[PDB]
Design an enzyme around this catalytic site. Structure first.
Site, PDB file in Angstrom:
ATOM      1  N   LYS A 125      -4.605 -10.050  -8.055  1.00  0.00           N
ATOM      2  CA  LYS A 125      -5.321  -9.429  -6.944  1.00  0.00           C
ATOM      3  C   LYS A 125      -6.344  -8.464  -7.545  1.00  0.00           C
ATOM      4  CE  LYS A 125      -5.007  -7.028  -2.516  1.00  0.00           C
ATOM      5  NZ  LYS A 125      -4.234  -6.170  -1.589  1.00  0.00           N
ATOM      6  N   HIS A 173      -3.586  -3.033   7.729  1.00  0.00           N
ATOM      7  CA  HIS A 173      -4.629  -3.345   6.758  1.00  0.00           C
ATOM      8  C   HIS A 173      -5.206  -2.043   6.220  1.00  0.00           C
ATOM      9  CE1 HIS A 173      -8.375  -4.895   5.081  1.00  0.00           C
ATOM     10  NE2 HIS A 173      -9.009  -4.051   5.863  1.00  0.00           N
ATOM     11  N   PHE A 174      -5.389  -1.989   4.876  1.00  0.00           N
ATOM     12  CA  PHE A 174      -6.050  -0.853   4.243  1.00  0.00           C
ATOM     13  C   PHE A 174      -7.542  -1.152   4.131  1.00  0.00           C
ATOM     14  CE2 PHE A 174      -5.640   3.122   2.053  1.00  0.00           C
ATOM     15  CZ  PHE A 174      -6.817   3.163   1.336  1.00  0.00           C
ATOM     16  N   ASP A 175      -8.390  -0.352   4.798  1.00  0.00           N
ATOM     17  CA  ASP A 175      -9.772  -0.756   4.923  1.00  0.00           C
ATOM     18  C   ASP A 175     -10.623  -0.065   3.857  1.00  0.00           C
ATOM     19  OD1 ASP A 175     -11.281  -2.650   6.592  1.00  0.00           O
ATOM     20  OD2 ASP A 175     -12.478  -0.937   7.320  1.00  0.00           O
ATOM     21  N   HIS A 179       0.769  -1.237   0.000  1.00  0.00           N
ATOM     22  CA  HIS A 179       0.000   0.000   0.000  1.00  0.00           C
ATOM     23  C   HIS A 179       0.805   1.295   0.000  1.00  0.00           C
ATOM     24  CE1 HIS A 179      -3.604  -2.335   0.390  1.00  0.00           C
ATOM     25  NE2 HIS A 179      -3.126  -2.909   1.497  1.00  0.00           N
TER      26      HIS A 179
END
Ligand SMILES: Nc1ncnc2c1ncn2[C@@H]1O[C@H](COP(=O)(O)O)[C@@H](O)[C@H]1O
Length: 124
Positions: A41, A119-121, A12
């Site tokens: 992905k 984590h990228f939410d 990210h």
């Protein structure tokens, strides 16, 4: 092993560009960051801000995570980001993506000591 923190950086972070490098960026970056390794992905976001700025989000606005945990945080300022989205015509191993640049508040989940993004939410 790859820590969760390192995995967030790999998947990210892209502080080197200020914004998406035209049309080719996702094709190159999804590959070079190993997100086309065992599949295409389907969706991924890169943040064009300093590490320190992204890490500092873990102490900004507390918001619910999409999975229902409480460890998610929204940036007070907008950030430069690039969304990558796999095309309809994309076929593994030749993974193809649309590159969409924008300025949005990010939402990250944080964990650990030190308390860092894992984590990228979402972006909003
Ligand atoms: N609140 C969270 N804190 C840490 N990691 C998370 C969080 N939400 C999702 N993840 C990570 O993101 C992946 C996608 O979440 P899920 O859609 O719930 O399976 C999970 O497998 C975790 O690796």
């Amino acid at each position: 092993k790859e820590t969760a923190a390192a995995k967030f950086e790999r998947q990210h972070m892209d502080s080197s560009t200020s914004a998406a490098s035209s049309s080719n960026y996702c094709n190159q970056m999804m590959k070079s960051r190993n997100l086309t390794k065992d599949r295409c992905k389907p969706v991924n976001t890169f943040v064009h801000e300093s590490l320190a700025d992204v890490q500092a989000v873990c102490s900004q606005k507390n918001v619910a995570c999409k999975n229902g945990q409480t460890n998610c945080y929204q940036s007070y300022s907008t950030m430069s980001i690039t969304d990558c989205r796999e095309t309809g015509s994309s076929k593994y191993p030749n993974c193809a993506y649309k590159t969409t640049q924008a300025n949005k508040h990010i939402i990250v989940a944080c964990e650990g000591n030190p308390y860092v993004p894992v984590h990228f939410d979402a972006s909003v």
